[PDB]
Amino acid sequence: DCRTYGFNTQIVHAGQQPDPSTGALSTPIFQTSTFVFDSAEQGAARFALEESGYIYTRLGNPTTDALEKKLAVLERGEAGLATASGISAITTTLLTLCQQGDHIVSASAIYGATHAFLSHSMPKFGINVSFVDAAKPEEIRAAMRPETKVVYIETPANPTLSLVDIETVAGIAHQQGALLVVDNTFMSPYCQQPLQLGADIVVHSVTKYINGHGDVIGGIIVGKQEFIDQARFVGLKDITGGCMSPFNAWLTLRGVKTLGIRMERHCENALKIARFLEGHPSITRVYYPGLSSHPQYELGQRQMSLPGGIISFEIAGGLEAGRRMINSVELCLLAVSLGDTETLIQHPASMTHSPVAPEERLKAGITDGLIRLSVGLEDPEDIINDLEHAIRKAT
Amino acid sequence: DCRTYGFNTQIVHAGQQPDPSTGALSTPIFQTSTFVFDSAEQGAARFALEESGYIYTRLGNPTTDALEKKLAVLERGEAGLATASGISAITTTLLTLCQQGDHIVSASAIYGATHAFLSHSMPKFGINVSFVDAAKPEEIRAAMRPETKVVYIETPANPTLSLVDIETVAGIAHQQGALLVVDNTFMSPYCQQPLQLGADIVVHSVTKYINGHGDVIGGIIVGKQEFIDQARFVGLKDITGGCMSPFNAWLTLRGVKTLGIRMERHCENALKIARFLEGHPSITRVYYPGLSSHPQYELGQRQMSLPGGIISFEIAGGLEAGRRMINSVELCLLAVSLGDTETLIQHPASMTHSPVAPEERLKAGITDGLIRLSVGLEDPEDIINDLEHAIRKAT
Amino acid sequence: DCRTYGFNTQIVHAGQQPDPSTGALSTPIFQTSTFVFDSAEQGAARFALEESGYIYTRLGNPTTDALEKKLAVLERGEAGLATASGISAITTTLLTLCQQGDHIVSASAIYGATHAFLSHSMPKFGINVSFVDAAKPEEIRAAMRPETKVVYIETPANPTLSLVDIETVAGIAHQQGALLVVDNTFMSPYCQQPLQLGADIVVHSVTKYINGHGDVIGGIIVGKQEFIDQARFVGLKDITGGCMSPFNAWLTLRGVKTLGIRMERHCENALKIARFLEGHPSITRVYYPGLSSHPQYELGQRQMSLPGGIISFEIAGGLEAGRRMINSVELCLLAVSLGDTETLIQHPASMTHSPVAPEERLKAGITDGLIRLSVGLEDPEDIINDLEHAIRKAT
Amino acid sequence: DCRTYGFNTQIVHAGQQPDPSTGALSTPIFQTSTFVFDSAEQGAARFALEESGYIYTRLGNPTTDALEKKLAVLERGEAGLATASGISAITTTLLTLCQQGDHIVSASAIYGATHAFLSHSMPKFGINVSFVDAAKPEEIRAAMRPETKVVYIETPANPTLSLVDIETVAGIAHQQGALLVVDNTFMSPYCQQPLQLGADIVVHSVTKYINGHGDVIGGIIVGKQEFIDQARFVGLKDITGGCMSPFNAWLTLRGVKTLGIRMERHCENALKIARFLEGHPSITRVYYPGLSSHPQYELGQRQMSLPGGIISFEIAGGLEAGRRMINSVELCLLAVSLGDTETLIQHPASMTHSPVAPEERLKAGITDGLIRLSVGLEDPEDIINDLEHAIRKAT
């Protein structure tokens, strides 16, 4: 029972063991679609759910099962379900929970494709969504309705790294009879554990920190066994079909083995870079949970064991300065992902949101000089020198 | 332009080319999540859809792009979209096309998880489904409604390998203003091409023949560029998130290279085994498009270039005989998939449908002695001798 | 016991079985370096060779073990040993068998890197090699010495596809107390079985036909258990260290599943292309075992079940014509490998042997207009039309 | 030019870059055997070595090239060459450097299969080896002969973690005109850099720390470009054929990205466990470079930036106590590898060397109670509690 060891030991060992056939230490890649039964009796046993085995990889698989058990342990949930993408973990969750007529209260500062799913796809199926500022828990309460099945939040949230009081939101949702689903992608279980704070369901894009090596698109869902069985035998099997390939599970198991030491280096590196940016006369704002000037600093200190690897910051001179600076880094790479071992940088005003009206973007927290930085495992002095060089150039 | 060569040449070369960086012949495994831009300008160009490149693997990927282009060529469609599973190809299609209030006419003899999706998940989102016997095209017409967006069919269909007149159904659907979606999984593009017969959209589980090696769960969607862009930038990106991992795409590209020679051997082997079963006094019925006694034999001859690798057959003595025979093979393997290089066998009455009421199953075409056989690439005499041994045992 | 079924059944099933832990049909990828023991006793048991298990992937591995067992079955040898390359299979063999003072008789028409190993590396370790024309078995006998441990041959041989009478050479070697090692790469076990003809050891580059998909560098060694144990526990473990990665073994297991149907299509396609080339007035010579004009045609008919997928041919007008024609194909690809699913072509006089003196190359069988063709699985009319177009251009 | 950044930055970025075709951040897996040329001219250009490209994966490959460039940077060598195993890196080196008549001076405390290669395989090819105690540099000098081409050392050495003064041995070898080859496997470039100390060639089993994830068998060779070209175009191409598969290279690139943070945690964890063992009344000896009682402690402080992740120690009560304790761990795993993320333990007296005469083993430094520990990334308190439990049991 691995649930008893320290959290680093669990990251290494939870859900894994030497192969019972051969002693192979690495979990084998069960890259198979079909499983063979010894008897007609066994096929019937496994299919009606009266026997525990494997049948078919869309349903379950030994490599994926290890990833699922591990992350269940690390989030302190009963069960895990892996998915083809983080988006797929989110929609497999909500399409399992919601039907025509149901309602959802959702943070507005959430991942873009989640916003499009809730804004345009959900109401198309008869499921209505109210969007609120999840940093003010009263807004969550005001929007709740007799039909509300789910409150949905992300913390820290993009793009300004605002926070959401999970424990407080969980009590509000629970009192009105709703579930709290938390996207814990930015933090990983090493830094934040929503289920310990009262959330019901945790979703991750394992694409980001949990895998950590920028070579896997994936997601995971953690929660009660009864909900997870529904998300598997209805949500995955019937609705999204978003199963994770066993190779992607195996890469994620391998990437997650260094989660603890990676997050330590990410956050130590990020704290140094945030302090450097807070002292730079060309940087108007730095958004980072580890800085004292952060509006919800003490909530972050209660709710997160580390301030995280993501920084946002605003550069003197708006849209053209951010573009100059972003075209002037030589070590940070221009990309839209985060959580990789390489430092990644994006300038949303001249990249992702370039054909959006300026004051349409500004309502959504994205200013003309806002830059988001995914701090990698490089030497922080090298990242800082690069940033200093590009900032200095850009002004 | 590979669309000009013979169909075997296309299976080998369509969508593929030596790598422009290095001349590597095998398509590289671009096992990456993130892509890097050279400039802020490039990020903005690619994101608004004004420039053709790559951004993020959930959206698109060079390895997956090759698989998509290849199968587009082989089905004679404009564009392809790969998915995490065959189920995901089906639901990404229909959830892209349908919204609250829409209606679907569907064959009843369809894959089980498709039946559960249409029967229970679709009406939950406000989308109603009428199920009909797609072997009688008038039933399709009778069920059509002003709200019908889609007619959905599978041919050949499980479990009795009944057929559906694609060209006739396509005209009916088109006259009433609906699209025809065809699941072409059983046949592969080598044996049947729905889009040439007037279907609008073709879906496959590449898990079966297209990959052929029983080591990939995947699906593909082929059709017009305008629909495929919606299925990608809304259906995948926002709703299912069912993207295919680039490794699974690469295995499918590799498996499909032998599609033509595999299907030839499957069908040659299957024809021999069907004739053997038709002559066996303990076998009451053999269902196989290549046998003259097949109810729709001449339609199969117009619509399919080969009779296929799947056989169903009924064994003297019902439920207990089928169980004895299935527990008595020593070379065919008991499994629920099909299209692998190994011969696979299942007895649905005592496996998949064992806790279903007998006359509930019989309405659904599954009799007590029905066995489904996925004929592999073994020597047919060996498969036959094994079958003969087990049949002989079972009675 | 799979050694009892037909040869296609064996290609599918030999050495493989459903996983005993999970029923997974595909052999798992045991991508591990280390294996764990349950007890100190077990470690000691396995290490002294008193117990059968796994210890460490350089020594053995369950995925590699399957590949080894399969190819042992197909060559009718007792045991197999997989290697990092075909070269590594050859040198692990000979460095296991030979020591300072030993001697080798070798065909001169052998693979280039084998020629460099024998010509320059072997005598550097005190092991002398005499090179002979292995198409004249008397030359083999004349060169034999009291120190000769090994006769080494390749058949068919490059570049002119000359043949070597395996059964006759085997008797000569055995009478003088030497072993016959045969490189069976060109033929694969499907087309030729040296061990049935009296060879002692068979080596393959699985890079070519056995894998067949141009994505694996590998080799295999088949022979008696007593020699194979030495080649493993001394040759691999201590001398070359050329072990195969378990992923490469798994890809080779997957590629070899279609060996029988691939070789049939290769040889059927090759026969058609050879007949086309024999009729072309711009083609001076066609070398192909399936053509009646082949100098050793009837030996090929006794010794090979099919004439093979490789053709060589000479083009009117020597060096500049061969260069024009090779720069004028648009479907055959310019590459130096063979056995892939794509048709591959090379012009050794202006590629591999371009800075070699013309009459140095001509002693080695390579004329100015010689072209080697690896016939793929495309439609033969497409390959022929391409060849016809390029030949026509080149003259 | 990545050779200019900090050592962590180099671990992340050296030898790697976004793909020039597509911007893919992860280095693509160029899992190909064959490369295609655009022209006959290009084939001839690349083959004679007059042009820089790719030809064939046994020779070179873009994925393997990245791994080679990276590790060249980290060791401060000109060039790298990857191999199928650590053994293959060692023998490809020495079989490239040595021929019949040459001589080698070698540490006796070296890896077992290296000892078998030098003791039994080398003299079989006419290459003589003298074995010495490399901790006394005078022994190295005394054994040198006019024929000596190579001095070969390992530091730290198994099983007692004795050290070898690289800088001093390098001067001795160089004065007598020999090369110094150092096996740097135990340390990785993060902890020790032989080439900066005057070694000529560095070899690694990347199986251990450089990959770090217990799922790759591999080796690497770093040194001057002129020697590396010989080791590639003669040693690999002709003699061992021990090339690394591009998938194994890609896994090693991925594993090495966390080398710096893994080695920090290994050594921090190991220091704590060594201090715990030094204080335990049932532990007679602890061998660890970080302990002051270590015979060569100050040399270790000059030559290594960290004391390493390996500990050896002797347990009260000899052979039966070591066996009890090893059969009594429940978190450390019994295995013979090292450098994995899991803590690994072995008791050589009752496992690897169990059928060796007791005083044969004791000459070789292996006492009856000697245990070797590969300290993983678990929580050290958990490892210690496990060790304490098993020690306490064993006595």
Ligand SMILES: *Cc1c(COP(=O)(O)O)cnc(C)c1O
């Ligand atoms: C990237 C991200 C996602 C989506 O994950 P994918 O694997 O890309 O589908 C969801 N939520 C958050 C907070 C993300 O950062």
Ligand SMILES: *Cc1c(COP(=O)(O)O)cnc(C)c1O
């Ligand atoms: C197996 C199958 C499917 C489902 O494909 P998956 O990849 O398993 O999700 C869909 N349709 C048909 C006809 C099938 O046979």
Ligand SMILES: *Cc1c(COP(=O)(O)O)cnc(C)c1O
């Ligand atoms: C290609 C070849 C080899 C070498 O195999 P590799 O896997 O490239 O090392 C050996 N013998 C023959 C006949 C070959 O064609």
Ligand SMILES: *Cc1c(COP(=O)(O)O)cnc(C)c1O
């Ligand atoms: C394990 C080891 C080797 C051998 O490496 P392999 O990859 O197993 O062949 C060589 N040297 C040392 C010091 C080792 O620990």
Ligand code: NA
């Ligand atoms: Na903190």
Ligand code: NA
């Ligand atoms: Na037909």
Ligand code: NA
């Ligand atoms: Na013949």
Ligand code: NA
């Ligand atoms: Na130190």
